[PDB]
Design a protein around this ligand. Sequence first.
Ligand SMILES: [Ca+2]
Ligand SMILES: [Ca+2]
Ligand SMILES: [Zn+2]
Ligand SMILES: [Zn+2]
Lengths: 403, 404
Amino acid sequence: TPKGTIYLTFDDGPVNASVEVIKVLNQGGVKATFYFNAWHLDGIGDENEDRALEALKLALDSGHIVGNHSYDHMIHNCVEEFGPTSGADCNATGNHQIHSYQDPVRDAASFEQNLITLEKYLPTIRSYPNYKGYELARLPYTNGWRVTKHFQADGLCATSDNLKPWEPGYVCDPANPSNSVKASIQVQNILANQGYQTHGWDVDWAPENWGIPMPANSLTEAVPFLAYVDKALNSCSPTTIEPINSKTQEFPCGTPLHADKVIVLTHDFLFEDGKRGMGATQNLPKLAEFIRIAKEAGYVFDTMDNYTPRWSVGKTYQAGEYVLYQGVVYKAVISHTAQQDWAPSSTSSLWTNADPATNWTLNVSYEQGDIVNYKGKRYLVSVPHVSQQDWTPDTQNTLFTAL
Amino acid sequence: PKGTIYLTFDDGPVNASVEVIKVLNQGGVKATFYFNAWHLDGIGDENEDRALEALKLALDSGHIVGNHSYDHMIHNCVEEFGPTSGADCNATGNHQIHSYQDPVRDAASFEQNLITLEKYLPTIRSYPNYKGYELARLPYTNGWRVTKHFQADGLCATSDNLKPWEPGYVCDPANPSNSVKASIQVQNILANQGYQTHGWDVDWAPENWGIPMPANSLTEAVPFLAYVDKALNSCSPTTIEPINSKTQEFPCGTPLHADKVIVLTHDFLFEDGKRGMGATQNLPKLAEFIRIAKEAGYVFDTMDNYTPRWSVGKTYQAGEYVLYQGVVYKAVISHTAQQDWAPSSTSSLWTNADPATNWTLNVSYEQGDIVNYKGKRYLVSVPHVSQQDWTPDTQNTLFTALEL
Ligand SMILES: [Ca+2]
Ligand SMILES: [Ca+2]
Ligand SMILES: [Zn+2]
Ligand SMILES: [Zn+2]
């Protein structure tokens, strides 16, 4: 058995720098997950991105998983009016993490616009099974999780209503989060109701020193970075990670789905020779070496579509274990061996639906105190039970209490 | 029942939709509404200040909501799309000219529709009868993507220059307009996103568009019921007039179409306004029609049930079709359905029969089928059922890559 599983996740592509990243992954014999912002395809993301479409194609042809990071990384919330210069304008002020989320309905819509743009520039994109843009997402700035009904948590100081975390007098209060944070929580919930899973991260491969003129040069070297990964293995990193805005304060430490796994966050743009330093020259070798030594150390690499393991026939499942099947999360009812014809579903006796959603749904095991939406109204679950078609909340005033 | 009628209303939500919905409720039937969300933005050039109220009433009443595109393709009717474009296009009457152009943009209008609906009614996904992401119908076009073996296009639905009633108009199904070809591509893009699309058998419309107040001439209830009887098991999409409403290659006798009539009509025909006294004259036609159709032995259903739901305990014959969790399946063998033996991507009892073209698991592929996979096109050389190990890029005895 492997020491553990590493999930390499790259955010904020597709950009020019993405091309050589992908080749290093391919040479290293691994697959990774890229959470993309399609505004780079429109040439308005203020990066070197004329090869953005080439990069998207290469990632997909190479078998890497493509997930959804929103169309514009929420830069519409950093400027007065969104347009071709907004990316540059927001870099001018450095106000990315201030008022990052405002109208959650509009902000969640940015993930659907991302799908439109990706499918505009690459009209064949849905013929790739590794296109997961409509299944897997990650919120900008936010170490937030919607994995299963019992595995979800928010980044409670991810974004701010005024001061940045390093500025003097900055105050983070998880118990009374910022308006931006509250908005981001609603965004998570909207996406979950559209069938997305969202995942945060355990470790962030970033500059060790942002105060030099080429901060990318300071990216952690492979050996010490592997030490960070070893340290994160089974140690609830999302609660102890720094800085404070990268935390998931109420991450469910010890949750079985998270055991023996480390999600690495990094950014394509840290591997470019450019305005952040000699990223290609200094850091592509670090990536190559990290992959080699991680494997030597006993790790294997996987992608986020398998973070929740796919249901597989012949496997013996235990009561309470989670699988993913056709994009939906299910939880085993009893110990059994999966047969071909016994796949999880909305009518299975062997599984219940355990998507991290809040709209009332068939064959879900509801707990007391859960709140579900049904036909535009909210309902408290008063009697815990497994939902069925004839027990809709509008007809069941003992099991549910209207709010 | 002697048959099932599917009442379908297009081009809402508008003020006129409110009274239609109430007649349906009092008549004890559910219907399907194919909506254009631009009315919620107030730019659709109808009486539409109650648009959001109507969308809510349709949903709260249990009617099914389906996707008719954001702007009814008016962006293709004008030079630059804006708040006045519906009015501009009505001023010219060029709706059916160049109606489909860039099919990627045109299909994206269906996704934009989802965005706008979910903007004005953030709770909309909490309604099981919201089917905006599952059921669609193309503007102007009697086109169908129901199953892998039940699909056909409206070959003269739209034009590159001349309207069907104008001097010089020619329609050739064997060499369709550029607009039509683009619309065929839109159908395929939507099918690959999981949509079914459905056309219609009969269109409840003005008998005479040339008289003043043309909405008033909407067919009376009794003769309209006559039209429905005539359509029942008679392949109406091939014989219907006018020419731009035809589905020339409709698969007459296809099993899912048996004993069913889909009626198309438009909410706006039922208001008192610019098209005539539609509320006064036509709401009672709708009410009476429902009553006499039930008397004659018809029942009414919605388009989410046009492909019947998989039902536990039911016996199925090999070859029969069901809808399960939004996906069409065909039975591989006769058997009795049971709880844990539902259709799926791994079932031995069913195969996926969605009307899509991207390579998909557990599909019964036929010789000559062309599938898309990882950006390339493949011809199926021998029939087989797809499985994870048999991907087209690795199975050259099953698939042959086509040249770009
Ligand atoms: Ca999902
Ligand atoms: Ca479907
Ligand atoms: Zn990011
Ligand atoms: Zn229409």
